[PDB]
Design an enzyme around this catalytic site. Structure first.
Site, short mmCIF file in Angstrom:
data_model
loop_
_atom_site.label_atom_id
_atom_site.label_comp_id
_atom_site.label_asym_id
_atom_site.label_seq_id
_atom_site.Cartn_x
_atom_site.Cartn_y
_atom_site.Cartn_z
N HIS A 35 0.82 -1.21 0.00
CA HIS A 35 0.00 0.00 0.00
C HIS A 35 0.85 1.26 0.00
O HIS A 35 2.07 1.20 0.20
CB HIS A 35 -0.92 0.03 1.22
CG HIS A 35 -1.61 -1.26 1.48
ND1 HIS A 35 -0.90 -2.40 1.78
CD2 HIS A 35 -2.93 -1.56 1.46
CE1 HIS A 35 -1.79 -3.35 1.93
NE2 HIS A 35 -3.04 -2.89 1.75
N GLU A 95 1.67 3.10 1.98
CA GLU A 95 2.61 3.04 3.09
C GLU A 95 3.89 2.37 2.65
O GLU A 95 4.97 2.96 2.74
CB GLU A 95 1.98 2.29 4.25
CG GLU A 95 1.41 0.94 3.88
CD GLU A 95 0.06 0.68 4.52
OE1 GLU A 95 -0.69 1.65 4.73
OE2 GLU A 95 -0.25 -0.50 4.80
N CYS A 148 -1.56 -2.37 7.64
CA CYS A 148 -1.67 -3.83 7.58
C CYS A 148 -0.50 -4.49 8.31
O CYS A 148 0.60 -3.93 8.36
CB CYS A 148 -1.74 -4.35 6.13
SG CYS A 148 -0.21 -4.09 5.17
N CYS A 183 2.64 -5.02 6.40
CA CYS A 183 3.41 -3.79 6.31
C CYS A 183 4.12 -3.57 7.63
O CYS A 183 5.21 -3.00 7.67
CB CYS A 183 2.49 -2.61 5.98
SG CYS A 183 2.02 -2.51 4.22
ZN LIG Z 1 -0.25 -2.16 3.92
#
Ligand SMILES: [Zn+2]
Length: 194
Positions: free
Chosen positions: A67, A69, A98, A101
């Protein structure tokens, strides 16, 4: 007419107004705000233009599972972050990142640490015990996952939506999540109960 000029009328007041988390977890996007760290300095002037917006899920080989991120995780290596200049990054996302992540941002930001990451999340993705871990390790060191409430709101609103005639948005319901969402950051960060 973008983030520095102006977003869309039915963008924030429509979706960001009393609407925690997107109707469908996808196309996440975080706006960045960074300061300048000069070996003791921290230029917190009017620095903020926005950030990336990548999604994990997909429907093809492109499905990498990263993402905005993780996209931010990439901004550093290119940013020349620290090695050239340390910036205090403060991104504003619609929700959490997440767990996956959590490990990625952690290893680079948590396990390494040499940059500031403030990811504002209007609501921590809570389905069946997921996401909580994402901000846990992150907010702990891989990325300070802050709560996107009234305060982060006024900032969020003007983050992408200059105002279009509206200074700051109220929402209110985000205040509820303020005590909740925030209470979670403290509960997930150190596996704290209350
Ligand atoms: Zn993520």
């Amino acid at each position: 007419e973008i983030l520095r000029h102006s977003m869309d009328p039915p963008t924030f007041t429509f979706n960001f107004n009393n609407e925690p988390w997107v109707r469908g977890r996808h196309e996440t996007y975080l706006c960045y705000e960074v300061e300048r760290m000069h070996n003791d300095t921290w230029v917190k002037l009017n620095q903020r233009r926005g950030f990336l917006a990548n999604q994990a899920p997909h429907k093809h080989g492109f499905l990498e599972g990263r993402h905005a991120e993780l996209c931010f995780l990439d901004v550093i290596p290119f940013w020349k972050l620290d090695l050239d200049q340390d910036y205090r990054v403060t991104c504003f996302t619609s929700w959490s990142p997440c767990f996956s992540c959590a490990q990625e941002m952690a290893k680079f930001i948590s396990k390494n640490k040499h940059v500031s990451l403030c990811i504002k999340t209007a609501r921590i993705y809570d389905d069946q015990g997921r996401a909580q871990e994402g901000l846990r390790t992150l907010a702990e060191a891989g990325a300070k996952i802050s709560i996107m409430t009234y305060s982060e709101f006024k900032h969020c609103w003007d983050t992408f939506v200059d105002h279009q005639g509206a200074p700051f948005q109220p929402w209110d319901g985000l205040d509820e999540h303020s005590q909740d969402l925030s209470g979670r950051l403290r509960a997930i960060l150190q596996n704290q109960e209350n």
